[PDB]
DNA sequence: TTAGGGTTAG
């Protein structure tokens, strides 16, 4: 007899293990913590409008919620509820499992999860649709490089073209999205044999590519990325450079992925089954012809 | 256990 009960977020009590549905208001993509497992922080909200911050840990990266953007809808099974500093918080419990869905009205309802076996009923369809209806109104779009501003944080959907070690504390990712930034990208000094990727393709693209420097904890992740894959770089930071190291006046746009995980700073590889990747590929094809 | 959301400051 399989009957799952979902608890409204405003009815959660400490010292319990529950099942919940919610819309993602904020999230830190999976990152190897200072401990044993990978960690993902997800703040969800539902019709009760009560927010719940969930601390999710797992030895396997894919076991954590497959969330690609705020607004996504999640279903959490075996979520433990506890109190931390008078604040109720959700944390992973043994057997924790999640399903993630697109959060926009009319979008396909395709559960994303690493679980081989999982319960999925008509009730789940209704639950998801109900959250999309609520979200369309109680709460809430992809920025192209040609539209970035001088100094801001943003999430960049792009394709990785090249990788290059720099100084251990930082690592270079050369990416593109098919559009050109308003000011030329800065260019990190690279070495001779260090940059991996199609050098001639990169050279022909000229300023269609940008240099992103990632720091600290982001380095080993960047080091593992496969050239040619599609990525979403969260909370990338743009900074215009009007004065160079030799004290000369100029203009270049710097791109930094600063150390730490605050505000979701991180990188998640986007599979080709991702609808944003389909659109990106077309922009890349178009840019490739006129260049 | 990790982390406990809230931007490096290169």
Backbone angles phi, psi at A51, to 5 degrees: -90, 145
User: A36 CB contacts (<8 Å, ≥6 apart)?
Assistant: A59
Q: CA at A230, C1' at B6: how many angstroms apart? A: 28
Across all strands, nucleotide nearest A26 (CA–C1') = B5
DSSP bridge partners of A249: A243
Resolution in angstroms comes to: 1.7
Give A143-291's CATH code, choosing from 2.40.50.140, 1.10.3720.10, 1.10.10.10, 3.30.70.20: 2.40.50.140
Q: CA at A184, C1' at B8: how many angstroms apart? A: 22
The answer to whether the beta carbons of residues A59 and A37 sit under 8 Å apart is yes
Q: CA at A217, C1' at B7: how many angstroms apart? A: 15
Sequence-ordered alpha helix ranges (H) in A197-248 = 199-205, 218-224
Angstrom distance (rounded) from CA A110 to CA A96: 20
CA diameter of chain A: 73
Across all strands, nucleotide nearest A235 (CA–C1') = B7
Cα R_g (chain A), whole angstroms:
21
Across all strands, nucleotide nearest A82 (CA–C1') = B4
Across all strands, nucleotide nearest A151 (CA–C1') = B7
Q: CA at A290, C1' at B2: how many angstroms apart? A: 48
Angstrom distance (rounded) from CA A201 to CA A7: 52
Q: Strand A51-58 and strand A153-165: pairing?
A: unpaired
Across all strands, nucleotide nearest A45 (CA–C1') = B5
Domain locations in chain A as residue ranges: 1-142, 143-291
Angstrom distance (rounded) from CA A16 to CA A169: 42
SS3 A256: strand
Structure obtained using: X-ray
- Same CATH topology for A1-142 and A143-291? yes
Q: CA at A19, C1' at B9: how many angstroms apart? A: 41
Q: CA at A6, C1' at B8: how many angstroms apart? A: 40
DSSP bridge partners of A83: A88
Could you please state the CATH topology (level 3) that the domain comprising A1-142 is classified under: OB fold (Dihydrolipoamide Acetyltransferase, E2P) (2.40.50)
Angstrom distance (rounded) from CA A209 to CA A189: 15
The answer to whether the beta carbons of residues A8 and A130 sit under 8 Å apart is no
Q: Residue A68: name the closest of A230, A210, A221 by CA.
A: A230
Backbone angles phi, psi at A127, to 5 degrees: -60, -45
Across all strands, nucleotide nearest A170 (CA–C1') = B10
Paired tokens of A141: 């779009």
Taking the mean position of all CA atoms in its chain, how far away is CA A104?
A: 17
Q: CA at A89, C1' at B2: how many angstroms apart? A: 16
Q: Name the protein residue, with chain letter, whose CA is nearest the C1' of B2.
A: A35
Q: Which nucleotides of B are covered by protein (CB under 7 A)?
A: 1-10
């Amino acid at each position: 007899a399989t009957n799952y009960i979902y608890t409204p977020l405003n009815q959660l009590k400490g010292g319990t293990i529950v099942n919940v549905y919610g819309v993602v208001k904020f999230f830190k993509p999976p990152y190897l913590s200072k401990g044993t497992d990978y960690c993902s922080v997800v703040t969800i909200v539902d019709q009760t409008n009560v927010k719940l911050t969930c601390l999710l840990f797992s030895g396997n990266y894919e076991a954590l919620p497959i969330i690609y953007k705020n607004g996504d809808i999640v279903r959490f099974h075996r979520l433990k509820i506890q109190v931390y500093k008078k604040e109720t918080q959700g944390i992973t419990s043994s057997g924790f499992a999640s399903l993630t869905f697109e959060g926009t009205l009319g979008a396909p309802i395709i559960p994303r999860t690493s679980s081989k076996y999982f319960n999925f009923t008509t009730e789940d369809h209704k639950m998801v649709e109900a959250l999309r209806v609520w979200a369309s109104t109680h709460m809430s779009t992809l920025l192209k490089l040609c539209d970035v501003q001088p100094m801001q944080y943003f999430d960049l959907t792009c394709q990785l073209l090249g990788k290059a070690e720099v100084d251990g504390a930082s690592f270079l990712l050369k990416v593109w999205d098919g559009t050109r930034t308003p000011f030329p990208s800065w260019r990190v000094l690279i070495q001779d044999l260090v940059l991996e990727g199609d050098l001639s393709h990169i050279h022909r693209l000229q300023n269609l590519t940008i240099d992103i420097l990632v720091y600290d904890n982001h380095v080993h992740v960047a080091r593992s990325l496969k050239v040619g894959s599609f990525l979403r770089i969260y909370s990338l930071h743009t900074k215009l450079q009007s004065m160079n190291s030799e004290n000369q006046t100029m203009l270049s746009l710097e791109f930094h992925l600063h150390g730490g995980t605050s505000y979701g700073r991180g990188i998640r590889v986007l599979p080709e089954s991702n609808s944003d990747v389909d659109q990106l590929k077309k922009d890349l094809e178009s840019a490739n012809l006129t260049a």
